[PDB]
Design a protein around this nucleic acid. Sequence first.
RNA 1: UUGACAUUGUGAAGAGACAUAGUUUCUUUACUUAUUCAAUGAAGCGGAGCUGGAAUUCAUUUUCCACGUUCUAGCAUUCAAGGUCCCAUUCGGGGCUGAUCCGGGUU
RNA 2: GCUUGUGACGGCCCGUGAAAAUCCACAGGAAGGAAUAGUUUUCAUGCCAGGUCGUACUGAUAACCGCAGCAGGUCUCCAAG
RNA 3: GAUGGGGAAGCUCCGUUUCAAAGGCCUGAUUUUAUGCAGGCCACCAUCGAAAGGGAAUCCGGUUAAGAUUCCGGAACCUGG
Lengths: 233, 252, 121, 52
Amino acid sequence: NPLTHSTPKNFGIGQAVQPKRNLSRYVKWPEYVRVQRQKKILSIRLKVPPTIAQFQYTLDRNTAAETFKLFNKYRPETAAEKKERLTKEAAAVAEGKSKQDASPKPYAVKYGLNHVVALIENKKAKLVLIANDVDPIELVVFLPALCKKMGVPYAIVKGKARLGTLVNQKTSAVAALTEVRAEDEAALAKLVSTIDANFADKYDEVKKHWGGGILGNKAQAKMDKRAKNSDSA
Amino acid sequence: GRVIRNQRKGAGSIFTSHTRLRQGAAKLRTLDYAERHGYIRGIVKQIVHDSGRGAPLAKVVFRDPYKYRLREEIFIANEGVHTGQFIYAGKKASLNVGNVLPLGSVPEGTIVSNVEEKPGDRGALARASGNYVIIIGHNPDENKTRVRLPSGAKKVISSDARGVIGVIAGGGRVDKPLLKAGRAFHKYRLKRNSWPKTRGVAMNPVDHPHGGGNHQHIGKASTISRGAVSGQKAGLIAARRTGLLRGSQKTQ
Amino acid sequence: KALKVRTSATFRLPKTLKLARAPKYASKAVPHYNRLDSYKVIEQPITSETAMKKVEDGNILVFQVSMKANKYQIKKAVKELYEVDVLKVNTLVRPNGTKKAYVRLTADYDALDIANRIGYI
Amino acid sequence: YATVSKTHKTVSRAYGGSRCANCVKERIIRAFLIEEQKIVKKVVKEQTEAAK
RNA sequence: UUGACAUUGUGAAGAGACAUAGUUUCUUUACUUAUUCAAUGAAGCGGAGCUGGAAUUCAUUUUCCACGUUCUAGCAUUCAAGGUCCCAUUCGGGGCUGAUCCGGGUU
RNA sequence: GCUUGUGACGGCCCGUGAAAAUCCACAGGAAGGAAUAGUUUUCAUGCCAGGUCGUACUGAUAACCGCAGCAGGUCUCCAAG
RNA sequence: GAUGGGGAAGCUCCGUUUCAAAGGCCUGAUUUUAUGCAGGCCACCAUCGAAAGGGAAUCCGGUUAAGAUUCCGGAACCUGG
Ligand SMILES: [Mg+2]
Ligand SMILES: [Mg+2]
Ligand SMILES: [Mg+2]
Ligand SMILES: [Mg+2]
Ligand SMILES: [Mg+2]
Ligand SMILES: [Mg+2]
Ligand SMILES: [Mg+2]
Ligand SMILES: [Mg+2]
Ligand SMILES: [Mg+2]
Ligand SMILES: [Mg+2]
Ligand SMILES: [Mg+2]
Ligand SMILES: [Mg+2]
Ligand SMILES: [Mg+2]
Ligand SMILES: [Mg+2]
Ligand SMILES: [Mg+2]
Ligand SMILES: [Mg+2]
Ligand SMILES: [Mg+2]
Ligand SMILES: [Mg+2]
Ligand SMILES: [Mg+2]
Ligand SMILES: [Mg+2]
Ligand SMILES: [Mg+2]
Ligand SMILES: [Mg+2]
Ligand SMILES: [Mg+2]
Ligand SMILES: [Mg+2]
Ligand SMILES: [Mg+2]
Ligand SMILES: [Mg+2]
Ligand SMILES: [Mg+2]
Ligand SMILES: [Mg+2]
Ligand SMILES: [Mg+2]
Ligand SMILES: [Mg+2]
Ligand SMILES: [Mg+2]
Ligand SMILES: [Mg+2]
Ligand SMILES: [Mg+2]
């Protein structure tokens, strides 16, 4: 009120300088930004062949969380942990005269691509996890097919980084179980089943299903409006 | 023999343009938000000579919609526009001399200038003193608009291609005999190094297809094929008829 | 949550931490000594007759002086090497490629004394 | 002009050493009237909106 | 310059063979991501919605246009005044709204 | 009067006869400011400093180019009766 | 004529703001302290290229065998602090 005054302001073309708005939709990104964006786009416009696109079908957040939960109980030794174990066996074994078996049979997650592969091949794994990233996708594309043939129940999972966490590397590519303490075989059968029902069983049908072929949405609206109107008046 | 003249022009050395004095490049406003949703006002602050150009330019200044400042444009002055006049640019603008409108928004028979070939190219068609184009058609679906260019040719372009109402100023310039050699001289002095012109037929063979002989003569058909090759094409290139044009011209 | 909000459409190179050099061995082990001290600045008296006249009549010392040296360095070096105050300093380059300094002393000093106290005449 | 007192670089009217006075008589009247007729323009069409 | 092959992909109608099931090949005409051209200190795109209103209602909306500037050679800038909420009231200062939503395809 | 400078004009052009550094001004009003005393250096006066390189002479029937102290060539200012 | 670049077997050729994440000023925040962060800007994108173009400011008198708008005398003016 006082000697204060309502002025409004008219931004209606022809007058008043435009205000500051969010041009974020318009900013001229650095090329590296523009490329990786359009890579994802271009990747989706093309019709991607079935043996890719069987990926993208990531495990669901609930089951996975339940699966990381288990796998976490099986992390590989830590630097300390192993150092500690050594001095335990290195001292004790050599004197107590045990057969290099004053160490308990370790149960941990198997990893590394080449490791896990011969494992699957030798029917020793019981649950392979495969990341959905993995940029030369080839390191990994033969795995569902493989795991299928070896009757080894597997799951494609969000997170090469996250497979990396549970194994102490930045990344991982694959994480696998072969062994397990009896206190856990229970929830692993359970786990294996959800997974088996989402992947291994569905593998044959997924194999027939090409992917991609998706329009951008300026084009989508174009034919959602052209195809609404044309046929049904 | 030697490289003939019309192939030397290409490396542009002495043949580049005499640009030092020109006002700048004539162009329409950039096809921004204003000009393509509504209109936008300006003032012709000055209309002025451009060296080596027939037609005068019109300096026209506009507010920046996005910043507090003046932004000046260089227009080719249509006949009749005057300093201090308001110029209107936009789809929703009104049809008077000076204003700039998209060929879609102006009826058949509108007479416009400096028109774009594709929307936004900031002005391509009819800019020489006197010239203009006339809208002769519209095709509401796929918005084309048909025009006749100064050459007589008819083209079709986007309805959004902008033009400016009226005709370019300074017309008639070429009705005036140049009278003497120097008046050409000074003309070309402010254009390019294209003048005067030795006839090839006055040259020697090293110089030209036409050179040599004990009398001056062209020695073979002076109509040369399109498939000719550089160093060959002097004469009447790809000429499809030849000789005194008797009878009314003018496209059907 | 959601995205940033850039009001401008130009993206610019981020302002990134510029660390200053903290070496691990040194440039040259021993710094260079003063490449142009008063003894290397001011080379000899110039004692042509027509220069002595500037001393006698002009309260002016003429020295041949280092090429690498300017009016500043000449002035200071004369001050320091000779216990004198300097009014102004004029220089030129001789035609054998040597710098000559017309050094004017202030009214308190007497270049002539000062001339045959450094020992020429 | 940087070696000279500021009174050598203006007259004391508005737009002093910049615009020619007769020219500021001008922009004053224009400013006034146009701002007036602006109030005139809005009440003509404020009515039109309620009279149609 | 003209043809073939490679860059080369996606629909649709039509021709063409195992001899009238659809793997395959060309004629047409669609698609956009390759490729190509233009523009801009990648500024207002595409989709929905508000209000108005032409419209004629065959149950009620089935739609279509709009949806801040044109007597005048002025003036238009300080995240905007206003409105409203916070800091613990200092001067300063911050959100929201003013300026509708949704998609990040610069057009 | 002569030479040069300059003004206000007038002729001409399909010719209408550079740029940038730099300087000032104005529109704006962020903000900063007095009565026990504040603002003010575009008013005056006052203090210190201003580096580096060139700087002689010839410039022509002998100091430059023409094999040379060559009747040739080689840009320009001042201009008495 | 460098530069992100694009050609070229390559000596190098093209491009000069060009399909580039191109850079720097004003003061504030420090009263561990010297200068990090806090705003707001401005997006101009090298550089060389005129001793006749543009351009801050000096004059008269005297003086040398040979320098002088440069020394001496007197009287100024400009830029920066
Ligand atoms: Mg453990
Ligand atoms: Mg050119
Ligand atoms: Mg010529
Ligand atoms: Mg001819
Ligand atoms: Mg001729
Ligand atoms: Mg001849
Ligand atoms: Mg020939
Ligand atoms: Mg021939
Ligand atoms: Mg002949
Ligand atoms: Mg003849
Ligand atoms: Mg004495
Ligand atoms: Mg000197
Ligand atoms: Mg005055
Ligand atoms: Mg004021
Ligand atoms: Mg754009
Ligand atoms: Mg003269
Ligand atoms: Mg004139
Ligand atoms: Mg001024
Ligand atoms: Mg403030
Ligand atoms: Mg002063
Ligand atoms: Mg310095
Ligand atoms: Mg001399
Ligand atoms: Mg002589
Ligand atoms: Mg001679
Ligand atoms: Mg180059
Ligand atoms: Mg230079
Ligand atoms: Mg100069
Ligand atoms: Mg000069
Ligand atoms: Mg004298
Ligand atoms: Mg002497
Ligand atoms: Mg002399
Ligand atoms: Mg003096
Ligand atoms: Mg001063």
